[PDB]
Design a protein around this ligand. Structure first.
Ligand SMILES: Cc1noc(C)c1-c1cc(O)cc([C@@H](O)c2cccnc2)c1
Length: 127
């Protein structure tokens, strides 16, 4: 079995812009979620081969993870904060679609999501 290519993190054709909100997403939001005790399953793309989940990429067609998000932030991939917020949302929603409501991995995602939303409440206004 095989994993798909990861989500795009480099594209010289895509216009880029640094914004105070993007800087906050890296320096506050991502950094805080990354250090959380439940972050580890989310720090890299799901390796469906290693985890013996052959159905994963049949069910999840818009994959996303914090490793990818970290690279997109550090390598200035984004034009705006909404693109980055959408990536986090995709990551959470994927987890909830693929797994069962009770599952440990779901409780971990929910903890991270609660935290994420608290941090998004302090998103600075655009300079
Ligand atoms: C994220 C995500 N979304 O769907 C799946 C499935 C994962 C996932 C990713 C991993 O890297 C490891 C594990 C699994 O071994 C685990 C981790 C923690 C608790 N309970 C189970 C699950």
């Amino acid at each position: 079995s095989m994993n798909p290519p990861p989500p795009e993190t480099s594209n010289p054709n895509k216009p880029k812009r640094q914004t105070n909100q993007l800087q906050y997403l890296l320096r506050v939001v991502l950094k805080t979620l990354w250090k959380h005790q439940f972050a580890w399953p989310f720090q890299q793309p799901v390796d469906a081969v290693k985890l013996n989940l052959p159905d994963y990429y049949k069910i999840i067609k818009t994959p996303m993870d914090m490793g990818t998000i970290k690279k997109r932030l550090e390598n200035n991939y984004y034009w705006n904060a909404q693109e980055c917020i959408q990536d986090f949302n995709t990551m959470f929603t994927n987890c909830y679609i693929y797994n069962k409501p009770g599952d440990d991995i779901v409780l971990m995602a929910e903890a991270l999501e609660k935290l994420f939303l608290q941090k998004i409440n302090e998103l600075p206004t655009e300079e």
